[PDB]
């Protein structure tokens, strides 16, 4: 009746493994090898260029390690904010109007056979946090990251900082590091945003949260606190609107 169509009478979600869909792309080689085939590809989508690109930024950026003690509650970082001062990727970030990229995050924990515990790594898209009241200073802590807390700006661990229970948090892309089975995790995050490209300096695409599901314990006289290391590699980057300097 009417030509305008406003009224006409009317496996890929559960953190797919790399080998399932894309196995011909072990180009990651060289911070780890043979663990790239047990990685999770978020939403079963591989980062890709904008269809109908720097080389230095392809490298890995190993942030500082953090100490998992018998008291820690959790840690979190923001992407791309966490890489706002890492060499040429940060340079490009600050001297362009628009930019886009995916990420590859590798988390590692150095532990002996006499340590026990479990960690969960979650990749929240548009991770709007909240404390217990925000400013630009709180939502962007930099590579230093921030720390959750139990019962400054420190969200609540069991609510994930946004009012939703921690147990349900497994809807987000996630992985589990159980010290007695494996001690490495890998997430391949594609570009997620309502716009096809956006200003990096103002908008954080992703947030990364690490929470201890089972506390740390160890045999007597061992190391009382173990280190956790993050390694982030941008993928398929591209920027437009280059300014001077």
């Amino acid at each position: 009746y009417y030509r305008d169509s406003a009224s006409n009478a009317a496996s890929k979600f559960t953190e797919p493994i790399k080998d399932v869909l894309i196995k011909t792309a072990p180009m990651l080689n060289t911070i780890t090898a043979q663990e790239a085939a047990n990685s999770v590809v978020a939403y079963g989508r591989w980062p890709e260029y904008l269809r109908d690109p720097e080389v230095a930024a392809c490298r890995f950026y190993t942030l500082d390690t953090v100490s998992w003690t018998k008291e820690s509650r959790g840690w979190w970082w923001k992407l791309p904010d966490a890489l706002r001062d890492m060499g040429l990727f940060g340079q490009n970030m600050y001297y362009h109007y628009l930019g886009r990229s995916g990420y590859t995050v590798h988390v590692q924990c150095n532990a002996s056979k006499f340590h026990q515990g479990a960690l969960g790594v979650f990749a929240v898209p548009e991770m709007c946090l909240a404390g217990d009241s925000t400013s630009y200073q709180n939502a962007n802590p930099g590579e230093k990251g921030g720390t959750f807390t139990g019962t400054r700006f420190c969200p609540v661990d069991y609510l994930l900082g946004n009012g939703t229970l921690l147990g349900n948090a497994f809807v987000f892309p996630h992985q589990i590091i159980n010290l007695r089975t494996n001690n490495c995790a890998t997430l391949v995050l594609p570009y997620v945003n309502s716009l096809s490209i956006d200003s990096m300096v103002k908008h954080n695409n992703w947030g990364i949260a690490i929470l201890p599901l089972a506390p740390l314990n160890f045999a007597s006289e061992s190391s009382p606190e173990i280190p956790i290391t993050l390694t982030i590699a941008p993928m398929c980057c591209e920027f437009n609107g280059l300014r001077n300097i």
């Binding site: 909240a130 939502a139 809807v171 309502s194 947030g207």
Partner: protein, 207 residues
Amino acid sequence: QHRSRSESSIESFFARGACVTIMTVDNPASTTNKDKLFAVWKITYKDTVQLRRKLEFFTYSRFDMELTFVVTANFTETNNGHALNQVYQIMYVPPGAPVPEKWDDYTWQTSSNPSIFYTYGTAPARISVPYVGISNAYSHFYDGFSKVPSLYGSLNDFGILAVRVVNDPNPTKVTSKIRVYLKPKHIRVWCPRPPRAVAYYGPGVDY
């Protein structure tokens, strides 16, 4: 398999009409010359608990709106004087245009704002608004600021609804209420999230 998953679909889960607002207007007595009331309401889903809570399961969304109006009236005093039939103007102001500030004003004249003229006692009025937005989808959660060293989590703009009574004052004051029933249509969602508890919810992601 004699069981279907067609009742949990997104369209089935969302596309259901529910009342979102009640707007009060009136036609005053012709003796007392107080201003004739008119109603203005900005379209937003952050006042209906059920629709919002069902939307916060996700982060990005797209949908059209279907709006229906149920009008009722009543005399507000025991007088033998009566009134003739009443006609109501229901103006939709798209996102970005001025809002009326007085009952008589050029805003109820602009060819840009589409209006409906509804005569009391007939079938309810209905319209459909398409997906109006500058991005490629609505965003219930937005980790960003407008200005960098500013509001933390963008807000969605849908339009405005204004309502008045075209008839000039009678010798009898008659008060009317319009109930708006909204129905999302052709809806799509992305990137599921955990749901929040019933803690009165909140204005933002704050709790």
